[PDB]
RNA sequence: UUUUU
């Protein structure tokens, strides 16, 4: 059980301030700053701004939970400036790689001593302010990586990303593995359990952790709902927050008794001076379809078209002559001429950021984007328009939550430019108004820890001499939240008594049986000895952290990757970085299906042993997870082919192919110094040759923000 | 609790600055032309 | 029918 307490220090009519103190520790109030400001600002800070600045000035960890449009970045800038002044190093980590590039750009523009460090790019890695991705930091922490020796602050941006069942575990790994002598700045969206995160930090690395929570937004919002069939918008909620039940009832009665649609609403919006506009849709086909439907309207001025020509010309001049004739460039240029553009994960990554620059400039007045244009990406609009409310998540087909609604709708309203933000919602099919009231009234969500066990975790922690997997299991946020319901498991004294007894008394082995099973598999295969100490076979697997390392190391040791060419080896490795499904299964030649069948046999042999050791794996999804849908594309690309020649052999978007190739280049990089572990020299340089004949014309291109 | 990085370094290769790159200045070139933008 | 190192 954890011994922490909260003090709830008073705040003067602004935000809410609380501090998590470790058990028997007296709350000493924050002393005032003695000296000069570490960073002056052109404006007047708000209450929560000043409180977070004061928390940073006293060398104490602080968490701020507010909106994106509130000014939550100022605190991190102050912390970076003060650590620069005191001759200390800083780390600024971001989940997404593009967000890292934009952050590096905007922080090089201001501090002038910064450095970028991602998997793809590394710029000036000797600085007191390093911008890195979360996985690079975790790799550094697992290795020696004597760069955190002289660091005093670590800044986590978008802390709510620790809610993913797939990639939220490396986040907790990074937080747990950090030293006890560093101070943190966590930035959050509005969450209910802000206090519980500070309690976890206090229990984790013996120090106070403050909490700043506010719901202030500089520009008020006004929400509307547009029923399917009608003319006019029904103001459901306004800048004061009351639900105005009469207009919700009127709209729903219209949709009930009565039950180009987007074109009319966009024309209405653009007639009453509501530019710019963001249209949010959850299918990439719908965005392009709506852009084509709006093609018959013009918004830009004659000079604006010259400006868009001038800004597009250089961005495509960097792209060489052959790629300037690609279909997508000539498809998108007229749309950007008219004043409209699309933004989805199927575009070329250079056109995406060109359109981002154009929208930031102000020459794009109606954007048609997917969900991941609002999460991160630093540009707001005046109006936000939702076309649908249902979305495919990955496992089912589901309604948008209140958290997603708040995230996307908060992009409306620009500080000082407009008086209020306008949000429009479309309802089309039997809204059944139990939902729709929940979306516009509810809180966003609590954040919960997933923290599943991985083989890389166990392999790395068995290599370190003074840390074990049990420690990381015990110190996880999952365990911390599962020790919190003592008041309510013991309080069942008033049948249900048997149940409540069972429930509380039972749990002692939470994710311990799984760990035992994983260890058993590891020592059965040969990665670790019976005495549970790592081997030569398991030190190779520690160098692979992109794909399934067990099966890859099984290939490395069995002798599957030798007697193969470089092209047909890098085509075989494409099965480990591509995870999307396609309509059709291409046909492979014998020299491209033999290695696939040997891959599948090794996968079956792995799965048999993994499932005879009480692990719950079905040997259909394991073999169906490795998808050879791009193996001939990769093989053709590493022969001298053209990008235009090759994005006609499959019905997969170009952006997906580019992403797969970048991931495969990263995996090849790790396979180079995973083969250079067992003294393999004939095989080490084959991966390097495969790396050389990938990155040639357009898949790997200089970033516009870099 | 957390041990020193010296013991972390043993048993694995160090961390290298793979794919080092430098600012080409294209972003500054584009920004140089952005003189009469609606936002500015 | 989105997503991401
Ligand atoms: N208290 C304040 N008063 C006036 N302007 C502010 C205040 N706080 C922040 N700002 C400005 O408003 C901007 C808000 O935009 P924001 O989304 O935070 O940009 P960013 O991506 O976080 N950097 C900040 O970048 C400041 O330029």
Structure description:
The complex is a heterodimer of chains A (706) and B (40). Chain A has 706 residues and is of the alpha/beta class. Chain A is 41% helix and 12% strand. Chain A has four domains: 4-213, P-loop containing nucleotide triphosphate hydrolases (Rossmann fold, 3-Layer(aba) Sandwich), CATH 3.40.50.300; 221-427, Rossmann fold (3-Layer(aba) Sandwich); 469-512, no CATH class; 543-692, Sec63 N-terminal domain-like fold, CATH 1.10.3380.30. Chain A contains 28 helices and 19 strands. In chain A, helix 21 packs across helix 23 (590-611). In chain A, 39% of the residues are buried. Chain B is elongated and about 55 Å long. Chain B has two helices and no strands. The A-B interface holds A 105, 117, 119-125, 139-149, 177-180, 303, 307, 310-311, 314-315, 318, 357, 360-363, 463-467, 471, 534, 539, 542-543, 669, 673, 676-677, 702, 704-706 and B 1-3, 5-15, 17-24, 26-27, 29-30, 33-34, 36-39. Phosphoaminophosphonic acid-adenylate ester (ANP) binds at residues 43, 45-46, 49, 68-69, 71, 73-74, 378, 415 of chain A. The structure holds one RNA strand of 5 nucleotides.
Topology:
The complex is a heterodimer of chains A (706) and B (40).
Chain A: E1 4-6, E2 16-22, H1 47-57, E3 61-65, H2 73-85, E4 89-94, H3 97-108, E5 115-117, E6 122-123, E7 129-133, H4 134-142, E8 151-156, H5 169-177, E9 183-188, H6 194-204, E10 209-213, E11 221-227, E12 234-237, H7 245-257, H8 261-271, E13 277-280, H9 284-294, H10 302-317, H11 320-323, H12 327-338, E14 340-343, H13 349-361, E15 366-369, E16 383-386, E17 390-392, E18 397-399, H14 402-409, E19 421-427, H15 455-463, H16 469-474, H17 477-482, H18 496-506, H19 513-525, H20 536-541, H21 549-558, H22 567-570, H23 590-611, H24 621-625, H25 631-637, H26 643-646, H27 654-675, H28 684-692
Parallel strand pairs in A: 3-9, 3-10, 4-7, 4-8, 5-7, 8-9, 11-19, 13-15, 13-16, 14-15, 16-19
Antiparallel strand pairs in A: 1-2, 2-10, 5-6, 11-12, 17-18
Chain B: H1 5-9, H2 26-33
The complex binds phosphoaminophosphonic acid-adenylate ester (ANP).
Phosphoaminophosphonic acid-adenylate ester (ANP) is lined by residues 43, 45-46, 49, 68-69, 71, 73-74, 378, 415 of chain A.
Chain A binds one RNA strand of 5 nucleotides through residues 95-97, 118-119, 133-135, 164, 166-167, 170, 281-286, 344-345, 370-372, 390-394, 397, 546, 659, 662-663, 666.
Protein name (chain A): Exosome RNA helicase MTR4
Main location (chain A): nucleus
Domain Helicase ATP-binding (chain A): 53-209
